[PDB]
Design an enzyme around this catalytic site. Structure first.
Site, short mmCIF file in Angstrom:
data_model
loop_
_atom_site.label_atom_id
_atom_site.label_comp_id
_atom_site.label_asym_id
_atom_site.label_seq_id
_atom_site.Cartn_x
_atom_site.Cartn_y
_atom_site.Cartn_z
N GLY A 99 3.61 1.52 2.58
CA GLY A 99 4.47 0.50 2.00
C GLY A 99 3.94 -0.91 2.11
O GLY A 99 2.78 -1.14 1.83
N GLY A 121 0.83 -1.19 0.00
CA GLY A 121 0.00 0.00 0.00
C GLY A 121 0.87 1.25 0.00
O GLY A 121 2.03 1.20 -0.33
N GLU A 168 -6.78 -6.20 12.86
CA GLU A 168 -7.19 -7.60 12.82
C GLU A 168 -6.78 -8.19 11.46
O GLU A 168 -6.79 -7.49 10.44
CB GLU A 168 -8.70 -7.76 13.04
CG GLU A 168 -9.52 -7.24 11.91
CD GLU A 168 -11.02 -7.51 12.03
OE1 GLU A 168 -11.44 -8.67 12.29
OE2 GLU A 168 -11.78 -6.56 11.84
N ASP A 177 -12.76 4.59 -1.80
CA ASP A 177 -11.92 3.66 -2.57
C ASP A 177 -12.44 2.22 -2.46
O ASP A 177 -11.67 1.28 -2.24
CB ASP A 177 -10.44 3.76 -2.20
CG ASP A 177 -9.53 3.27 -3.32
OD1 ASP A 177 -10.01 3.20 -4.48
OD2 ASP A 177 -8.35 2.98 -3.06
#
Ligand code: ATP
Ligand code: MG
Lengths: 296, 257
Positions: free
Chosen positions: A18, A15, A79, A125
């Site tokens: 990183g 992501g 989680e 998104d």
């Protein structure tokens, strides 16, 4: 909550910030996902992601468990969920996904989204790569790095938004205001994709995206979407495609599924169904929550 | 639409959870309400210089007051807290926040980039990353939807009055944002059109003129005294055509409450 208690297992994604790692709490046995930030100061995306996730505690929203600091590193402890929806659809290449699971997942996504919206958060998104599934049949909204807290009424926000294939027509046409309806558009695209296992509108540019949408739903006019022909990026030279038989958009869908999809893909954001209202759609009359049919 | 009621209810919950400690300034050995007023006035100027949203200003003030509710700060470091708060608020709220270098510049080289960034981290730790606070502005924009009909002078004047409340911790720290917004909206509506807090807002908020009276009495005095206040950046800001020149309007001499 400290880093000494975690044992890193493997990379599970990439992501901003990183790489994302799977890790194990050595003391409790809890399996977690670790998102690492290198420390312009703390990234705005991280500030929003953390602040908003701390408010958003819901079974269909990925849980932020801890934030671990240091002078030079910031770790976000989440989680762990076994798979994203994109990887699940790829795994279902030749089986298809059972309708009870598609229905379950859509219902759960609508629940998570309704909760976001009722807490003045836009996700912005929603795509299969950002929806995480577990072995017990849950699906959860993830990756809130592009989210923002909105106002009533909204003001103008960032115009970048939503990955292109899932981007609503009001963003593509450059409206000064967009709101919760943008997330519903993405979920409608995702609903279609669960059934066909291909993106509904796989455009390569903003104009290609718009034309793909227009060829599927018809080019909107002033009757279907008042104000459309006056929108900043609307051009009078746009081809005027007829609206095809809506049953041909996602052929396997039956009457109730078609009805719901059509309401999620309404051009006029005002008319487009809310997540809250969609929960009561007759498509869900027989909804259950089974485990996935495949090993994750 | 579908979420207006839910969001209002949620913001009413969160403004209680996000409220700074009303008596905190008495516990600060080195800083005063006057020093705070100077800081907030400066933040208004910074917001003007960089064309920041009003919401950003309101958030930064919330962050500062929450920070000072648990952290003792020397007078020489107060501006550093404010600078970091404004940087955080800008990152949270703005499409295009100013660069860290720009915040360093407007301190007039009082602080280094390293100090600003270390302070940013400290403020985040103290606030436990809880930055999505309700503001007077967030309640005002909801209340504006109840106008019959919409009036730009009312909206700008309500925003002006809400902003004036940010400057003076005594008395405004004791009132919730939803209450200050109610008082500001009524006072603006009354000044411009002669109308009063609408019944539709009694139904939405549960507030009446009776319940708003203590805050309204304070706000009215602040409004009447605004030309004489030591801090003037808000009055100057609201002379602009962007805000319909509302700081030029004459306050009412009486309210009949
Ligand atoms: N809590 C989690 N449990 C398991 N996997 C996760 C978790 N959070 C993120 N991931 C994995 O990381 C991947 C991408 O990270 P994320 O979506 O948070 O950021 P991104 O910026 O959208 O990444 P990209 O831009 O590459 O799509 C996801 O597809 C997911 O498989
Ligand atoms: Mg003191």
């Amino acid at each position: 909550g400290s880093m000494e208690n975690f044992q890193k297992v493997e990379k599970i994604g990439e992501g901003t910030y990183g790489v994302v790692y799977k890790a194990r709490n050595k003391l409790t046995g809890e399996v977690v996902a670790l998102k690492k930030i290198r420390l312009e100061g703390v990234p705005s995306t991280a500030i929003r992601e953390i602040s908003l996730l701390k408010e958003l505690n819901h079974p269909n929203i990925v849980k932020l468990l801890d934030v671990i600091h240091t002078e030079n590193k910031l770790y976000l402890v989440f989680e762990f969920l076994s798979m994203d929806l994109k990887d699940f659809m790829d795994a279902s290449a030749l089986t298809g996904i059972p309708l009870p699971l598609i229905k379950s997942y859509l219902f759960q996504l609508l629940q998570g989204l309704a909760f976001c919206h009722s807490h003045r958060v836009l996700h912005r998104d929603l795509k299969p790569q950002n929806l995480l599934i577990n072995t017990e049949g849950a699906i959860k909204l993830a990756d809130f790095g592009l989210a923002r807290a909105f106002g009533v009424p909204v003001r103008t926000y960032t115009h970048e938004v939503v990955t292109l294939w899932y981007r609503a027509p009001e963003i593509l046409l450059g409206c000064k205001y967009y709101s919760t309806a943008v997330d519903i558009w993405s979920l409608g695209c995702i609903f279609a994709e669960m059934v066909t296992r291909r993106a509904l509108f796989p455009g390569d540019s903003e104009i290609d995206q718009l034309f793909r949408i227009f060829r599927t739903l018809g080019t909107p006019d002033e009757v279907v979407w008042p104000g459309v022909t006056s929108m900043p990026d609307y051009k009078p030279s746009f081809p005027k495609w007829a609206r095809q038989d809506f049953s041909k958009v996602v052929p396997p869908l039956d009457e109730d599924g078609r009805s719901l999809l059509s309401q999620m893909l309404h051009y006029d954001p005002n008319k487009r169904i809310s997540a809250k209202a969609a929960l009561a759609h007759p498509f869900f009359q027989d909804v259950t929550k089974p485990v996935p049919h495949l090993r994750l | 639409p579908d979420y207006h009621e839910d969001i209002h209810t949620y913001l009413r919950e969160m403004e209680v959870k996000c409220k700074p400690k009303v008596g905190y300034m008495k516990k600060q050995p080195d800083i005063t309400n006057s020093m705070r007023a100077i800081l907030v006035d400066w933040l208004v100027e910074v917001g003007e210089e960089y064309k920041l949203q009003n919401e950003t200003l309101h958030l930064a003030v919330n962050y500062i007051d929450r920070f000072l509710s648990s952290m003792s700060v020397l007078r020489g470091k107060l501006q550093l807290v404010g600078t970091a708060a404004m940087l955080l608020a800008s990152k949270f709220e703005e499409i295009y926040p100013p660069e860290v270098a720009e915040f360093v510049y407007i301190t007039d080289d009082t602080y280094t980039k390293k100090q600003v960034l270390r302070m940013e981290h400290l403020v985040l730790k103290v606030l436990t990353f809880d930055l999505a606070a309700p503001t007077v502005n967030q309640f005002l924009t909801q209340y504006f939807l109840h106008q019959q009909p919409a009036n730009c002078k009312v909206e700008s004047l309500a925003m002006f009055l809400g902003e004036l409340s940010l400057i003076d911790a005594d008395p405004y720290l004791k009132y919730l944002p939803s209450v200050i917004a109610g008082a500001a909206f009524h006072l603006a509506l009354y000044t411009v059109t002669g109308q009063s807090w609408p019944e539709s807002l009694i139904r939405k908020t549960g507030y009446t003129l009776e319940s708003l009276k203590p805050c309204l009495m304070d706000l009215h005095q602040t409004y009447l005294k605004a030309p004489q206040h030591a801090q003037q950046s808000i009055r100057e800001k609201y002379k602009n055509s962007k805000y319909h020149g509302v700081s030029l309007l004459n306050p009412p001499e009486t309210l009949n409450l």
